[PDB]
């Protein structure tokens, strides 16, 4: 890791995407993206700039790498489809499980 | 518990009825199980009995599959995070240097 602390947790932004896709996909999908960030304590050096650049690839970084169970990533949304489509499996294998007997 | 994973189906091309969820599908389908676990007949299951039984564990038994945060992300959750993060990242900038010069 190195000399980066970690921001305290912030207020997450608003952001106008172009699309309706996006605007709408970013508004169920936020809880699942970070709420504060990893950057290096100010010094002379400091350029908004170099400073961004590290804390975007950081705390992206840092955030993929984290473990968790595949449904803390499931929204309504996927539910819906999930379901959808792990019935039409299940149909399936129940005419072959009756097709036999 | 009892239950036998079945082999691999084909996962199905689902035209659901907005733009949205049929965008949403086609970049997030890889994402959802592609065999099922199921009771098999012995003999009392009907229909009903079988497919809600066999969809209720195939979820709950995917759900609590352990992956990573960044094994999940597709192409636009990369993309769309960074342009969150960067946002997030300014605002830590004009705090954090904002203190610097005091």
């Known amino acids: 890791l190195g000399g980066y602390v970690l921001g305290s947790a912030m207020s ?14 970013y508004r169920e999908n936020m809880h699942r993206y970070p709420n504060q960030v990893y950057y290096r304590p100010m010094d002379e050096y ?3 700039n170099n400073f961004v650049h590290d ?4 705390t992206i970084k840092q955030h993929t790498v984290t473990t968790t169970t595949k449904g803390e990533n499931f ?7 999930m379901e959808r489509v792990v019935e039409q499996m299940c149909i399936t294998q129940y005419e072959r499980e009756s ?3």
Do not use: L, W
């Open 99 to 101: 097709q036999a007997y």
């Open 55 to 58: 804390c975007v690839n950081i």
């Open 46 to 48: 400091s350029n908004q």
């Open 75 to 81: 929204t309504e949304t996927d539910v819906k489809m």
């Open 12 to 25: 997450r932004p608003i952001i106008h995407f172009g699309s309706d896709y996006e605007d709408r996909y």
